[PDB]
Amino acid sequence: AYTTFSQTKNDQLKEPMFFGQPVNVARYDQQKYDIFEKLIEKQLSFFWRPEEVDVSRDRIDYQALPEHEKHIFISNLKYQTLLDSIQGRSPNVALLPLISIPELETWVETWAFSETIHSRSYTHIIRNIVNDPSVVFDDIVTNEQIQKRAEGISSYYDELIEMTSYWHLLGEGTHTVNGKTVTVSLRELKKKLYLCLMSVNALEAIRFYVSFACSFAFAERELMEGNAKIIRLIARDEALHLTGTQHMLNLLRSGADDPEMAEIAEECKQECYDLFVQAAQQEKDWADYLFRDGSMIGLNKDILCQYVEYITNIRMQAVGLDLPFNTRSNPIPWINTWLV
């Protein structure tokens, strides 16, 4: 039931963000929600190329680092690489088949594209600091400490993609496939999409920012300055990506877009809350594996843990969820030098 060009002439200003008629004409002279056009323009204005950044000194900096610090830096870089590997392809494969307005479709493609630039930047960094890049890349797929998160993230996407395929092929109803009953509910697919968006928002709002803290902690000591310059550019892109997911989520719950979605937003309010806490908890547990052999100037298990609660509280409130942690001011305001 999916088509690359719906032959029905429809009003793209009246379609819901998702599940409406697939988009036909890509036009940008008008939009249901201006924010997505603004985000596309900003992202295009931010276009940068990794190769332009000098990372010639990061090699020696990395070599001079104590072993536990090399571990902290590389483990963090591997996680960033993993996140953008998934983000460069998933928004496209998972969201594109369900978007019903042109500005969001193009925003999703632009967003995914900017992530491939990030992936290209990580290769640029990695090849200029280790001699044998292959060791680093393989450890990304099999690192036990890392794969727990990837699995959980990939899962939401994989499940939504699967349910979408069934919906497009069979439509709503109770069907039979090779002797098994297969139930396809649009309401459940909508719930799937909502929770997946919330998960991507957490990936954007928390997972990445916790990794930025680690990267910039090195920059503060004037180490790995090539890497810092690249992460600063990536962080500027992520701020836009998070702005996009926050608007999608708030538009869906404010009842402005699809009434049934506003309904669902309220329905799984508790589940959404636990999803967020879980993510915060994962980044916390990670700080354990990170500083297993020691800490460093500006960063340690406790400070990092405090930043997680701080950032999580802000992000959750931004999407209308209750705060899970004790309120406090920023534990590491020095990071603002590198962020927004």
Residues annotated in a binding site for Fe cation:
84, 115, 118, 204, 238, 241
* 157 near a second copy (CB under 8 A): yes
- Asked if 90 contacts 157 with a C-beta cutoff of 8 angstroms, the reply is yes
**Beta carbon nearer to a second copy, 127 or 292:** 127
Which among Hg ion, Fe ion, a second copy, none contacts residue 25 (Cβ within 5 to 8 A by kind)? Answer: a second copy
* 112 near Hg ion (CB under 5 A): no
Q: What gap in Å lies between CA 200 and CA 206, rounded to an integer? A: 10
Residue type, 4: T
* 109 near a second copy (CB under 8 A): yes
Which among Fe ion, Hg ion, a second copy, none contacts residue 116 (Cβ within 5 to 8 A by kind)? Answer: a second copy
Residues 25-64 as b/e (b if ≥16 CB within 10 A, e otherwise) read eeeeeebbbebbbbbbeebeeeebebeebebeebeebbee
Residues 40-59, one symbol each (x = binds a second copy by CB under 8 A, - = not), give ----x--x-x----------
* 60 near a second copy (CB under 8 A): no
Supply the minimum distance, in Å, between the C-beta of residue 82 and a second copy.
7
Catalytic, 122? Answer yes
Rounded to 10 degrees, what is the CA torsion of 217, 221, 224, 228?
Answer: 50
* 84 near Fe ion (CB under 5 A): yes
DSSP letter at 105 equals H
Which among a second copy, Fe ion, Hg ion, none contacts residue 76 (Cβ within 5 to 8 A by kind)? Answer: Hg ion
Question: Looking at 122, 156, 157, 194, which residue is catalytic?
Answer: 122
DSSP states of 143-192:
-HHHHHHHHHHHHHHHHHHHHHHHHHHH-SEEEEETTEEEEE-HHHHHHH
**Which 209-238 positions form the footprint of Hg ion (CB under 5 A)?**
210-211, 213-214
Supply the minimum distance, in Å, between the C-beta of residue 13 and a second copy.
10
Which among a second copy, Fe ion, Hg ion, none contacts residue 241 (Cβ within 5 to 8 A by kind)? Answer: Fe ion
* 133 near a second copy (CB under 8 A): yes
* 158 near a second copy (CB under 8 A): yes
**Which 303-332 positions form the footprint of Hg ion (CB under 5 A)?**
304-306, 309
- Asked if 197 contacts 249 with a C-beta cutoff of 8 angstroms, the reply is yes
Q: What gap in Å lies between CA 247 and CA 35, rounded to an integer? A: 8
**Beta carbon nearer to a second copy, 127 or 328:** 127
* 115 near Fe ion (CB under 5 A): yes
**Beta carbon nearer to a second copy, 203 or 335:** 203
Supply the minimum distance, in Å, between the C-beta of residue 45 and Hg ion.
25
- Give, in degrees to the nearest 5, the angle at Cα 335 between 332 and 336: 110
Please choose, out of 19-27, 201-209, 236-244, 328-336, the segment that lies near a second copy by the rule CB under 8 A: 19-27
* 207 near Fe ion (CB under 5 A): no
SS3 track for 112-147: HHHHHHHHHHHHHHHHCCCCCHHHHHHHHHHCHHHH
* 183 near a second copy (CB under 8 A): no
Q: What gap in Å lies between CA 280 and CA 282, rounded to an integer? A: 5
Residue type, 34: D
- Asked if 143 contacts 78 with a C-beta cutoff of 8 angstroms, the reply is yes
Please choose, out of 169-177, 225-233, 246-254, 294-302, the segment that lies near a second copy by the rule CB under 8 A: 169-177
Residues at the interface with Fe ion (CB under 5 A) = 84, 115, 118, 238, 241
> Hey, which residues are catalytic here?
122
